Nucleic acid binder design. Structure first.
Lengths: 90, 87
DNA sequence: AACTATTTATAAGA
DNA sequence: TCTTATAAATAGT
């Protein structure tokens, strides 16, 4: 990036859409590279704010999702949590 | 990277494992940033070569997967396909 | 595991 | 979309 940007929701609609398209390609690209380099199985489902779907899966999506739903051990899972935060002085 | 690397399976076991751990964090990180920045719902399931699971989901994994299985329109889908290559 | 040069991604300005 | 300068990730150590 020509500038550092904060990680909060982009407010400009068209900016949000461009950022979405490029970052999504980059993310599927990094997913592909992870799967190849480290010999692992990835499935990546993305729904844009308008509920349109975009997906990546190394092997085969329904294979990976089946394996998921049957997996019955504790495992590393991360998520998004919203925090209350005070801003800078300005 | 201190070196450019080819995109093929890392042969050294321990190298593969370190690369896995760091790149996975980076990938979940970029996923989180995408979901926040562009207000979208992501689900990312990874099974390492030993069949151990690692996951990221912005909202809630079963929510996203339900939405997936019901989605009935054509959509952008990618996968990995193997190519023959000269050196 | 941390730290650093080299690469890979990406945001602003066009 | 493109260009470019800048920030962010990562491959070796």
């Amino acid at each position: 990036g020509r500038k550092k940007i904060q990680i909060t929701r982009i407010m400009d609609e068209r900016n949000r859409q461009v950022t979405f398209t490029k970052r999504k390609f980059g993310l599927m690209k990094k997913a592909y590279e992870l799967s190849v380099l480290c010999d692992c199985e990835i499935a990546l489902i993305i729904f844009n704010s308008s509920n349109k779907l975009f997906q990546y899966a190394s092997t085969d999506m329904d294979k990976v999702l089946l394996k998921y739903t049957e997996y019955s051990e504790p495992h590393e899972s991360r998520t998004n949590t919203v925090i209350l935060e005070t801003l800078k002085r300005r």
